[PDB]
Each structure stands twice: as C-alpha cells, then as structure tokens.
Amino acid sequence: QEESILQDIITRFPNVVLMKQTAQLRAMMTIIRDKETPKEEFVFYADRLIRLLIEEALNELPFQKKEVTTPLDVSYHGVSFYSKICGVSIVRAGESMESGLRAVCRGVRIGKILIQRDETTAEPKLIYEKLPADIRERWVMLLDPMCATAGSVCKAIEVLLRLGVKEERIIFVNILAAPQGIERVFKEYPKVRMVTAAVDICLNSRYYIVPGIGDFGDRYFGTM
Amino acid sequence: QEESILQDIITRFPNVVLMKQTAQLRAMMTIIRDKETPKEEFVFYADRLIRLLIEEALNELPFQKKEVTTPLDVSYHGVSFYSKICGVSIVRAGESMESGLRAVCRGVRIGKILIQRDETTAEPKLIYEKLPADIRERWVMLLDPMCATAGSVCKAIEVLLRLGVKEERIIFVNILAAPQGIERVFKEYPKVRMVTAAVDICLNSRYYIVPGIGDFGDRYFGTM
Amino acid sequence: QEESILQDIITRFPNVVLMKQTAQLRAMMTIIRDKETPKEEFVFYADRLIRLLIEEALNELPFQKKEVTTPLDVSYHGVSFYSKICGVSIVRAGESMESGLRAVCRGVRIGKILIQRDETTAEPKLIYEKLPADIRERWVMLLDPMCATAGSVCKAIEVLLRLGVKEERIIFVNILAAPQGIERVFKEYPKVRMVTAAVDICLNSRYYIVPGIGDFGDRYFGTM
Amino acid sequence: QEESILQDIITRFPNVVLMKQTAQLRAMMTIIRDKETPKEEFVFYADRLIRLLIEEALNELPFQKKEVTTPLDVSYHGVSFYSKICGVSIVRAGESMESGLRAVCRGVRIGKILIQRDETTAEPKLIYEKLPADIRERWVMLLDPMCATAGSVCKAIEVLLRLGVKEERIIFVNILAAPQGIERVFKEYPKVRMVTAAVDICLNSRYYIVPGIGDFGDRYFGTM
Ligand SMILES: O=c1ccn([C@@H]2O[C@H](COP(=O)(O)O)[C@@H](O)[C@H]2O)c(=O)[nH]1
Ligand SMILES: O=c1ccn([C@@H]2O[C@H](COP(=O)(O)O)[C@@H](O)[C@H]2O)c(=O)[nH]1
Ligand SMILES: O=c1ccn([C@@H]2O[C@H](COP(=O)(O)O)[C@@H](O)[C@H]2O)c(=O)[nH]1
Ligand SMILES: O=c1ccn([C@@H]2O[C@H](COP(=O)(O)O)[C@@H](O)[C@H]2O)c(=O)[nH]1
Numbered sequence: 001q002e003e004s005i006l007q008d009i010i011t012r013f014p015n016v017v018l019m020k021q022t023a024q025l026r027a028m029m030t031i032i033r034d035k036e037t038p039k040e041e042f043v044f045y046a047d048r049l050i051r052l053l054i055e056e057a058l059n060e061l062p063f064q065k066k067e068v069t070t071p072l073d074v075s076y077h078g079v080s081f082y083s084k085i086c087g088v089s090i091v092r093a094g095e096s097m098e099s100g101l102r103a104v105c106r107g108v109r110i111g112k113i114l115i116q117r118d119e120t121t122a123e124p125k126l127i128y129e130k131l132p133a134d135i136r137e138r139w140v141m142l143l144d145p146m147c148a149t150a151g152s153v154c155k156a157i158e159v160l161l162r163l164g165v166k167e168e169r170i171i172f173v174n175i176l177a178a179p180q181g182i183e184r185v186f187k188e189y190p191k192v193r194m195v196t197a198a199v200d201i202c203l204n205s206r207y208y209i210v211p212g213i214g215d216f217g218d219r220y221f222g223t224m
Numbered sequence: 225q226e227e228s229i230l231q232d233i234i235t236r237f238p239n240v241v242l243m244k245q246t247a248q249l250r251a252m253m254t255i256i257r258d259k260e261t262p263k264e265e266f267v268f269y270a271d272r273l274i275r276l277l278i279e280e281a282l283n284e285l286p287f288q289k290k291e292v293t294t295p296l297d298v299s300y301h302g303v304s305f306y307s308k309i310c311g312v313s314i315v316r317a318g319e320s321m322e323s324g325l326r327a328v329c330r331g332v333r334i335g336k337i338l339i340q341r342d343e344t345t346a347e348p349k350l351i352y353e354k355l356p357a358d359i360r361e362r363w364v365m366l367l368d369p370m371c372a373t374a375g376s377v378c379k380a381i382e383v384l385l386r387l388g389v390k391e392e393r394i395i396f397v398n399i400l401a402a403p404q405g406i407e408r409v410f411k412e413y414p415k416v417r418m419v420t421a422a423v424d425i426c427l428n429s430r431y432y433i434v435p436g437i438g439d440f441g442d443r444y445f446g447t448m
Numbered sequence: 449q450e451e452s453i454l455q456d457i458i459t460r461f462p463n464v465v466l467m468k469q470t471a472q473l474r475a476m477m478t479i480i481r482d483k484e485t486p487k488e489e490f491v492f493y494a495d496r497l498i499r500l501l502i503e504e505a506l507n508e509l510p511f512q513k514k515e516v517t518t519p520l521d522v523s524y525h526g527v528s529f530y531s532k533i534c535g536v537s538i539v540r541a542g543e544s545m546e547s548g549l550r551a552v553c554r555g556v557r558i559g560k561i562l563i564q565r566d567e568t569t570a571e572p573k574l575i576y577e578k579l580p581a582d583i584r585e586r587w588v589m590l591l592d593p594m595c596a597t598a599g600s601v602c603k604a605i606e607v608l609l610r611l612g613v614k615e616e617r618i619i620f621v622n623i624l625a626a627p628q629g630i631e632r633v634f635k636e637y638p639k640v641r642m643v644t645a646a647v648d649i650c651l652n653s654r655y656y657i658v659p660g661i662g663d664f665g666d667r668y669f670g671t672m
Numbered sequence: 673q674e675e676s677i678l679q680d681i682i683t684r685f686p687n688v689v690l691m692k693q694t695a696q697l698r699a700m701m702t703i704i705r706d707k708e709t710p711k712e713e714f715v716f717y718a719d720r721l722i723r724l725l726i727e728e729a730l731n732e733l734p735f736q737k738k739e740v741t742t743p744l745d746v747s748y749h750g751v752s753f754y755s756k757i758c759g760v761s762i763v764r765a766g767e768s769m770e771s772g773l774r775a776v777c778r779g780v781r782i783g784k785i786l787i788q789r790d791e792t793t794a795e796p797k798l799i800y801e802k803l804p805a806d807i808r809e810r811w812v813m814l815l816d817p818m819c820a821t822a823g824s825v826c827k828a829i830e831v832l833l834r835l836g837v838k839e840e841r842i843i844f845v846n847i848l849a850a851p852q853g854i855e856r857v858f859k860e861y862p863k864v865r866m867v868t869a870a871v872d873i874c875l876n877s878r879y880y881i882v883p884g885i886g887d888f889g890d891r892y893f894g895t896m
Contacts, residue, residue, distance in 0.1 A: 020244075022283050023303055030302025034292035040555030048328060052279060059248045068258040071438030072428060078254025079247055086670070091539075092560060092578060099547055104272060107488030109670030112540060114562070114576065128562065128575065130540060130671050204296065214295030222534075222557030223580050264779030310894075315763075316784060316802055323771055331712030333894035336764060338786070338800060352786060352799060354764060356895045446758070446781030447804050468692075470731045471751055478750025482740040496776060500727060507696045516706040519886030520876060526702025527695055552720060652744065662743030 001201075009179060009199050013186050016194045019056050025049070029198060033213050039222050046145075046220055049175065049197065050100035054141075057173045057195040058104070061085065061139060086111060086132050087141040090156055093217040094143035097173065101141060111135060113159065115152050124155040136164030142172045145216045147196075148209050150181035154188050167191040175216075176200060178209045226425070233403060233423055237410055240418045243280045249273070253422060257437050263446050270369075270444060273399070273421065274324040278365075281397045281419040282328070285309065285363055310335055310356050311365040314380050317441035318367040321397065325365060335359060337383060339376045348379035360388030366396045369440045371420070372433050374405035381413050391415040399440070400424060402433045450647075457627060457647050461634050467504050467645045473497070477646060481661045487670050494668055497623065497645065498548035502589075505621045505643040506552070509533065509587055533587045534580050536561060538604055541665040542591040545621065549589060559583060561607065563600050572603040584612030590620045593664045595644070596657050598629035605637050615639040624661060626651045674873075681851060681871055685858050689867045691728050697721070701870060705885045711894050718847075718892060721869065722772040725845060726813075729867040730776070732843045733757065733811060757811040758783055758804050762828055765889040766815035769845060773813065783807060787827050796827045808836030814844045817888045819853035819868075820881050829861050839863040847888070850874060850881045 009016060019025060028049045031037055037045075058081075066080040086109040087101045088094075098110055111131035115124050132138065140160060144153055153172060161167055168191040176198045185194065200209045208214065218224050233240060243249065252273045255261055261269075282305075290304040310333040311325045312318075322334055335355030339348050356362070364384060368377055377396060384394060391413050398420040404427060409418065424433045432438075442448045457464060467473060479485055479493045506529075514528040535549045536542075536559040546558055559579030565572045580586070588608065592601050601620060609615060616639040625644045628651055633642065648657045656662065666672035681688060691697060700721045703709055709717075730753075738752040758781035759773040760766075773780055783803035789796045804810065812832060816825055829842060842864040844857065849871050857866065872881045880886070890896035 023287050024279065024283050024305075026303045027287060027305055030290055030292055030300065030304065033294050033300050033302070035295045035297075036292065038555075039557075043550075043555045044330075051275070055248060055276060059246050063247050063251060066254055068254060068260070070257050070435045071259040071443075072432055072434055072436045073259075074435040076254065076257045076435045078250050078257070080254060081247075081251055095543070102491075106268070107486070107491045107670065109487070111671065112669070130665070130669070132671050208296055210296045211294045211298045211300045212296050217578075221559075221578070222555065223559060223578050262779075263781075267774070267779045315800075319767070326715070331710070331715050331894065333711075335895060336893070340800070352788070354889075354893070354895055441802075445784070445802070446779065447783060447802050471735050472727060472731050472753070474751050475735065475753050478738055478740060478748065478752065481742050481748050481750070483743040483745075484740065492778075499723070503696060503724060507694045511695050511699060514702055516702055516708070518705050518883045519707040519891075520880055520882050520884050521707075522883045524702065524705050524883040526705070527698050528702065529696075529699055554716070656744055658744045659742040659746040659748045660744050 002199075005179065005201070006199055009182060013182060013194075015186065015190070015192065016182065016196065017056070017060070018199070019053065019195070019197045025052070025197065033211065035214070039219075042219055046096065047100065050097050050145075051103060053173060053175060053195065053197055054097070054100045054104060057141060057171055060171050060193050060195065083139050084134070084137055085139045085141060086135060087143055088113060088131065088156070088160070090115065090142070090144040090152055091128075092221065093145050096145060096216070096220040097143040101143070109138075113156050115155050117151065122151075124151050126155065126159060129159065131163070135160075138165070139169045140165055140171065142170055144172070145175040145220075146209065146213070147172075147174050147177040147181035147185070148203050148207050150184040153181075154185060157185075157189055157192065171195065176209060176213055178203050226423075229403060229425065230423060233406060237406060237418075239410065239414075239416065240406060240420065241280065241284070242423065243277060243419070243421050249276070249421065257435065259438065263443070266443050270320065270399075271324065274321050275327065277397060277399065277419065277421055278321070278324045278328055281365060281395055284395045284417050284419065308358075308362040309333075309365060310359060310362050311367055312337060312355065312359075312380070312384070314339060314366070314368040314376060315352075316445065317369050320369060320440070320444045321367040325367070335364075337380050339379050341375070348375050350379065350383055353383065355387065359384070362389075362393070364389055364394045366394050366416075368396070369399040370433060370437070371396075371398050371401040371405040371409070372427055372431055373402075374408040377405070377409060378412055381409075381416065395419060400433055400437055402427050453627060453647055453649065457630060461630060461642075463634065463638070463640065464630065464642045464644065465504070465508070466647070467501060467643070473500070473645065480667075481659065483662065487667075490667055494544065495548065498545050499551065501621060501623060501643065501645055502545070502548045502552055505589060505619055508619050508641050508643065531587050532582075532585060533589065534559060534583060535589045535591055536579060536583075536604070536608070538563065538590070538592040538600055539576075540669065541593050544593065544664070544668045545591040549591070561604050563603050565599060570599070572599045574603065574607055577607065579611070583608070586613070587617045588613055588619065590618055592620070593623040594657060594661070595620075595622050595625040595629040595633070596651050596655050597626075598632040601629075602632060602636055605633075605640065609637075619643065623664070624648060624657055626657045677851065677871060677873070681854055685854060685866075687858070687862075687865050688854060689728065689732070689865070690871070691725065691867070691869050693870075697724070697869065705883065707886070711891070714891055718768065719772065722769050722847070723775065725847065725867065725869055726769070726772045726776055729813060729843055729845045732865050732867065755811050756806075756809060757781075757813060758807060759813045759815060760785060760803065760807075760828070760832070762787065762814070762816040762824060763800070764893065765817050768817060768888070768892045769815035773815070781810075785828050785831065787824050789823065796823050798827065798831055801831065803835065807832070810837070811841045812837055812843065814842055816844075817847040818881065818885075819844075819846050819849040819857070820875055820879055821850075822853040822856040825853075825857060826860055829857075829864065843867065848872060848881060848885060
C-alpha cells in the first residue's frame with residue numbers, strides 16, 4: 001500500500017524527489033515516530049535525518065563542470081556549484097532544520113516566515129517575516145518538516161513569489177508529507193521542486209498526518 | 225572510461241558498495257582532490273563527505289523489524305539495529321574518520337591499529353594496537369580513507385582475524401580506492417564488505433592513486 | 449574608562465555577572481564587532497563566544513553536593529545540579545543562542561517569544577509565544593544577545609512572571625549591554641540575574657549600542 | 673587537603689594555570705570520575721570540559737593590539753592573536769583533545785606522538801611521530817589528559833626540543849595532574865606553560881592518580 005502510494009506520487013509528480021528508502025532511514029523514522037521516544041533522542045535522530053535530507057536537496061541546485069589538478073599533477077574533471085542561495089524557514093517547525101542547513105553551508109543566509117491560520121475561517125495569515133534583501137535573486141531552500149494540508153507552505157510560496165522569487169528556483173525540503181498536501185502544492189506551484197523523506201497515508205480531522213509523527217514542533221522544541 | 229572501470233568492479237566484486245555518484249558527491253570530491261584547496265576547506269569538506277560515507281556504511285549492518293505506536297495512537301512498521309559494533313581506525317589516516325562515526329553513533333567503541341611498512345623491507349608490520357576486549361563479538365567498521373595496494377588494510381584484517389573477529393563481520397569503509405587494491409582485498413578476504421565513494425583509474429610509479437588525492441593523512445592533519 | 453564603567457556596573461548591581469575579560473574573549477568581540485567581518489566568520493566567532501557565555505550562565509543554577517567513587521575505588525566529593533530548566537529565546541536575535549544551549553544541555557526545552565515595539569507608541573508588544581507547559585516550575589535562561597533600552601527583555605520578563613515563573617529563577621544571558629538597559633532591568637525586576645560578556649558606553653538616537661556591534665539579528669542570519 | 677595543595681603548587685610553580693574551579697567544572701568532573709558513568713555520558717562530558725580547557729589554554733598565546741571600526745562607524749580597540757600554532761597529541765589519550773582543538777581552531781595543524789614504556793624496562797620510548805614540518809617555528813599545544821609521573825610528557829617534550837621547538841613555546845594542556853607530575857615537568861623544563869583543570873592528591877601504589885578518574889584513554893575510546 002505504501003509502495004503503491006509511493007510509486008503513484010512518483011509517477012504523478014515528476015518534481016518530487018523521494019529519498020532512498022534505506023534501512024537506516026527507516027530506523028531513524030521509527031525512532032522519531034515512536035510516541036515512547038524521549039526528547040533528547042528525538043532531537044538527536046531528527047537532527048541526523050535532517051542532514052541527510054539537506055544533502056539530498058542540495059543536489060537540486062545547478063552546477064558547472066570544473067576541472068582541477070591533483071597533487072599528483074594529473075587533472076580531475078569535476079563540477080562546482082556556483083549559485084546564490086539561502087534557506088527560509090517556516091516558524092517554528094522549519095526552524096528545527098536551519099542548523100542542519102547551517103552545518104553544511106557555512107554562514108548561509110537564513111530568512112524566517114511566521115504564518116498563522118485564521119480563527120474564524122482558518123485562511124493562513126502572514127504574521128511576520130525577515131528575509132534577505134536580494135532574495136529575488138536567490139535559489140530558495142524552503143524548510144518545513146511537515147506537509148499536511150499544505151496551507152502554510154502554499155502561503156509561504158505566495159509571499160516568496162510576490163517578492164520576486166522565481167517559482168522554479170524554490171526547493172521545498174520536507175521530512176514527512178501527505179498525498180493531499182503534495183497534490184495541493186503542485187496544483188498551485190507546478191514548477192517548485194520538493195524533496196521528502198516519507199509519504200504517509202492520510203490526514204485526520206485534526207489535520208495531523210497518519211500514521212504521522214504528531215506535532216513536530218512541540219516534539220522537537222519540547223513544548224508539549 | 226570511469227564507467228567502464230566501475231562496471232567491471234561492480235560486476236566482479238559483489239561485496240563492494242559504491243556510493244551514489246551525485247553531483248554534490250562529485251563537487252565535494254572536486255574540492256578535496258584540488259591541489260589548490262586550503263587546509264581548512266580540505267578538512268570541512270572531507271568531514272562532510274565522511275559523514276555521508278558513514279551513513280551509507282551503516283546500512284550494511286543487520287536489522288530486525290520493529291513496530292511502534294505513533295502519537296496518533298496508530299502503529300507503524302519499522303526496523304531497529306541490534307548488533308554490537310565498534311569502529312577501528314588505521315592510524316593515522318583512518319583516524320580522520322572517527323569524528324564522523326562518533327557523530328552518528330554516540331559513544332561507539334573505537335579500536336586503533338598502527339601498521340607501518342619496514343623502511344627497507346617495504347613490508348607491513350603491526351606497530352601498535354589498542355582494541356576493545358570483546359571485539360571478537362562485534363561488527364567492525366574498519367576505517368581507512370585510501371586503498372592503493374591494499375597492503376595496510378590486508379594486514380589490519382589479518383590482525384583482526386587473529387583476535388577472533390569474523391571475516392563476514394568487517395565492513396571496510398573507504399573514501400578512494402584503486403582497482404588493484406579492491407581486487408587484492410577480495411582475493412584475500414572474499415567475505416568482507418567494502419563501502420567506498422570513488423574508484424580511481426590506477427596507481428602510479430610511486431604507488432600513488434591517480435588521479436588520486438595526494439597523501440590523505442598529510443592533507444587532513446596538516447603535516448604536509 | 450571601560451574599567452570605570454565596568455566596575456561601576458559591578459558595584460551597583462550585585463546581580464550581574466560579567467564574564468572574565470580574557471584576551472581571547474576580547475579577540476572574539478573584536479572579530480564580531482568589526483563591520484568588515486564576513487558572515488561565515490561572524491557566525492563562527494559568535495557561536496564560539498555564545499558557548500562560553502552559556503557555560504558561564506549555567507553556574508548561576510543551584511547544585512547539591514554529591515559523592516561518588518572513582519574506578520580506583522576511592523571517593524570523590526562532587527556537586528550535582530538537579531534543577532529543571534529551559535531556555536526561552538527572544539525572536540529572532542535570541543534564537544541564535546539556542547544552538548549553544550542545546551549543545552551543552554542535550555534536548556533542553558526551548559520556548560520562544562516574539563515582541564515588537566509600536567511604531568508610534570514604542571510599547572513593545574507581544575506578538576507570539578510558544579513555551580513549555582510547566583515553565584512556572586522551571587529556571588529560565590532568557591536569551592537575547594543585545595540589551596539596549598531593555599524594553600524587549602522587560603516585556604519578555606513581564607509575560608514570564610504573568611505565567612508564574614519566579615523572578616529570582618530567571619537568568620538573562622546576554623552578550624552586549626548598555627548601562628541604561630542594565631539599570632532598567634534591575635529597576636523593574638531586582639531579583640533576576642544577568643550574565644553578559646560586555647558593557648558598552650552608550651546608546652544612539654536610533655537605539656543602537658555604541659561602539660556596539662550593529663544589528664546582531666541581521667548580522668547573524670544574514671538579512672542585512 | 674586540596675586547598676593546601678592547590679595553594680602550594682600555585683605558589684611554587686608560577687607557570688601553571690588552574691582553571692577556575694566553578695561548580696559546573698566540579699559537576700563535570702564528578703560525572704567523569706564516577707565509575708558508574710556510561711560511556712556516552714563519559715564522552716559527552718569529557719568533550720564539554722575539554723572544550724573549556726582549550727579555550728582557557730588559548731589565552732597563553734601572544735596577542736597584538738588591533739583597532740576596528742564597528743558598523744556604527746566608530747572605533748573599537750581590540751586585540752588580535754597572530755601566532756602560528758599547532759596541536760600535538762600524545763597517542764592515544766591526547767587524541768581525545770584533538771576535536772576540541774579543531775572545534776575552536778578550524779583546520780589547525782595536528783602533530784602526533786606515540787610514546788610507550790618498555791614492557792620490562794619501563795623506559796618510555798618514542799614509537800611513532802608525525803609532526804608538521806615547520807613545528808620549530810610554531811607554538812605548541814601539547815595535549816595529554818593525564819599527568820601522573822610525567823614520564824610520558826617529559827619524553828614528548830624532549831623530542832619536540834630535539835626538533836627545534838622553543839621550550840618557552842610549549843603550552844602543556846592537561847585535564848588532571850598529580851603534584852609529583854607537575855614537579856618533575858618543572859624541574860626538567862622550567863620554561864613550559866601548563867594549563868590544567870584539577871590537581872589530585874597523589875599516585876597509587878601502582879602509579880595511578882587518586883582519587884583520579886582511572887585510565888582516561890580506555891574510558892574515552894571504550895577499550896576497557
Ligand atoms: O502532523 C502535523 C502536521 C503539520 N504540522 C506542522 O504544522 C504546519 C501546518 O501544516 P499544513 O496543514 O500547512 O500543511 C506545518 O508547517 C507542519 O510543520 C505538525 O507539526 N504536525
Ligand atoms: O594515494 C595514496 C595511497 C595510499 N595512501 C595511504 O598510504 C597507506 C598505504 O596504503 P596501501 O598501499 O596499503 O593500500 C594507507 O594508509 C593510505 O591511507 C595515501 O595517503 N595516498
Ligand atoms: O545595538 C543594538 C541594540 C539592540 N539590538 C536588538 O534590538 C532589539 C531590541 O532591543 P532593546 O532596545 O529592547 O533592548 C533586541 O532584540 C536586540 O537584539 C540590536 O540588534 N543592536
Ligand atoms: O590515573 C592515570 C594516570 C596516568 N594515565 C596515563 O598513563 C600515561 C603515563 O603517565 P605518566 O605516569 O607518564 O605521567 C599517560 O599517558 C596518562 O594519560 C592514566 O590513564 N591514568
């Protein structure tokens with residue numbers, strides 16, 4: 001059922017890249033998903049998985065061929081990445097991913113976006129944001145560990161676009177998604193790319209993914 | 225060219241695991257192979273790449289199957305790794321990899337083996353070793369960035385075997401290898417597993433891997 | 449002169465604790481105060497200094513004598529810390545210290561408070577908060593690298609007190625402070641403790657500490 | 673008792689630097705000495721303390737005055753550390769201090785020395801060394817957690833001297849020491865500098881520091 005779900009996502013949305021489902025990745029996910037898991041452990045594994053995730057997403061950037069000479073005076077033909085990038089986190093869950101991104105891209109600029117779902121209805125509302133000034137000229141790693149209804153991420157993209165960010169330069173880095181959130185982002189922004197570690201079954205009336213992980217932000221920051 | 229070589233090795237040596245040759249992997253290999261690269265950069269990147277190699281390697285261990293119940297109170301089908309392991313570094317170069325292993329495996333036991341070639345005789349002699357008392361009962365993550373003639377690694381393996389380690393329980397974790405080294409390892413210990421990030425074309429007159437990386441141990445510790 | 453300001457602060461407010469002015473500390477502040485310093489560097493040194501600062505702050509917590517026995521089988525008399533704690537950061541500048549606290553206090557719960565002065569009025573207003581549920585029972589490490597007019601931190605303190613946190617259980621961790629900001633905090637909440645690494649001469653019409661460091665928040669997140 | 677001891681040493685040996693005996697420091701020491709502490713904790717806490725230790729040691733280096741202009745367009749009078757340095761690990765115990773050094777001094781050059789006492793004779797002998805080529809020009813941070821009889825460090829210093837390093841440029845970084853140890857090092861090389869976290873009572877009938885911590889290298893690498 002998962003396999004089938006996984007494949008269908010894959011065949012339906014060419015712009016999503018699913019991390020290789022290795023045993024270790026599964027191990028990590030079980031620890032993280034487990035209710036029983038203690039906070040220090042949750043953080044430790046969440047952190048480990050995020051780095052792999054980040055490494056995977058970085059492969060979505062553009063690169064050029066570059067040739068160098070080895071200390072053995074022989075040429076090596078490689079490549080180099082030359083783009084202006086930055087990470088944008090959705091507060092506060094996405095914030096949990098900044099350290100990951102900062103670990104591999106020393107001093108990368110970090111923008112933050114705070115979105116709130118309205119009380120009457122629940123249309124997401126932009127509450128606060130601090131972004132790099134030249135963001136319009138950057139590739140964007142948009143960080144949000146969980147994509148359920150996709151309401152938040154779609155709002156974040158709306159603002160990014162409004163500011164001038166090229167839709168095709170947005171890379172959505174995610175840990176766990178629901179087919180429905182996936183469908184929504186692509187129906188609204190077909191050009192963005194999305195990298196995720198997992199696709200779950202459904203959402204509940206409370207809009208939590210299931211089997212899911214619970215409230216990522218509460219778990220990672222320990223504000224249960 | 226490289227593809228040919230790779231195919232052969234992949235075909236003849238069913239126990240080697242080449243890591244996914246991603247653009248990122250390549251970019252990292254390009255910086256660390258560059259003779260112009262400054263030491264700080266050299267260290268940052270090697271570390272980054274080592275991290276990925278280690279993660280790749282851990283997939284070689286055996287795991288069970290484990291079910292957990294999520295906060296949504298539904299159950300999830302996962303896995304867990306239950307083996308006793310340890311890492312063993314070949315001094316000095318292998319040492320560079322210890323930080324990576326400790327990073328993902330808090331408090332993992334670390335054994336050290338200093339092998340040195342007689343200055344006249346050219347042969348490997350075990351100079352110093354300090355291993356965990358029950359190493360005979362664990363999986364050994366053998367660490368050595370480079371594999372040229374396979375002289376050193378072969379001797380390291382011989383000592384491990386004399387202590388009672390099971391051949392099939394050694395996972396040789398390597399960054400760069402020459403075909404001949406790979407071929408030799410397998411001739412002598414057909415049952416070990418080898419994880420590596422690159423396979424070079426050949427050794428040169430001084431038995432240096434080419435195009436190669438130079439002397440890993442010197443570039444990493446700065447005793448150039 | 450600095451000495452004079454330093455001493456004056458020190459004799460006037462028994463509750464503040466100034467980090468020891470070592471040359472290294474000063475080398476650090478030098479790097480980060482220099483408008484010439486590149487983001488990666490700034491980040492680098494800022495994190496380094498934050499680690500020390502945090503370690504310093506951690507000594508304000510209460511401890512118990514504890515006796516253990518060495519592997520040599522003789523006793524040692526130690527002094528364990530047994531209190532419950534948490535960090536609360538003032539978004540977004542304070543968030544920069546979060547990683548430091550987490551580095552040394554594995555999985556410490558982190559609360560966040562987002563405040564903003566009114567354009568006209570200048571009354572700092574609470575915009576958002578997410579804190580641990582039982583914060584009333586904890587000791588709190590309030591994090592804000594810069595304390596100028598102290599408006600924001602006094603507002604942050606107000607809400608903590610409203611929430612039930614005991615004033616004397618609040619430890620304000622700060623990098624740079626203005627004498628004026630210090631005086632306000634103590635006029636309003638004499639029972640809190642403050643740990644800073646440096647006291648500057650004054651504040652400007654735009655409310656920046658001088659000679660100061662500029663806007664810590666953009667400098668650190670790269671949104672300048 | 674201990675207060676007497678510290679006083680004597682401090683008085684008789686103007687070149688030793690004891691870290692401030694803070695409650696936190698004590699707390700870390702209690703966990704590390706405790707024979708019941710698990711290997712992960714042992715490592716986490718030793719790393720933390722080693723980090724403070726190195727930061728302390730770095731103050732032993734020479735520094736220049738430096739003035740910079742802040743973003744407020746105003747001058748600040750700082751200092752700069754200009755010396756070329758390197759870390760020198762005494763294998764294997766000192767290797768545990770490397771990460772700490774590399775954490776604060778990115779890509780700093782790391783030399784290694786393996787000294788061993790003859791199984792029969794007990795004479796400490798140089799078994800293996802790999803040092804920077806220009807070590808004579810640098811300031812040396814000699815690392816070794818424990819200093820019992822000082823036989824090892826004495827030998828290490830001796831070889832450094834034969835290479836041309838100035839006795840005055842050797843900063844011996846140590847976690848724990850015995851009075852005898854300190855005394856000998858100062859009798860033989862009155863000019864080195866020594867930074868340490870604690871000084872214990874005495875040595876065992878078997879030359880172990882008491883109350884001590886036991887065999888640090890075994891406890892840290894997990895080969896006990
Ligand atoms: O089970 C869930 C689902 C979502 N969220 C978080 O709440 C936000 C709302 O998700 P969505 O409904 O916009 O997609 C996301 O940023 C996500 O990180 C969780 O903490 N838990
Ligand atoms: O290009 C090379 C080849 C080997 N080595 C190092 O030299 C030693 C001898 O390797 P081998 O010939 O046994 O495989 C190993 O420890 C390896 O790390 C290098 O630094 N660079
Ligand atoms: O020179 C300064 C002074 C203050 N702040 C920031 O301005 C905010 C308001 O400071 P205050 O006037 O309430 O203390 C704080 O979050 C603080 O980090 C700066 O970045 N630089
Ligand atoms: O309680 C002790 C005393 C010494 N040593 C180690 O024994 C070696 C010899 O110490 P010494 O007697 O030369 O000073 C050193 O490398 C030191 O780390 C221990 O591990 N534990």
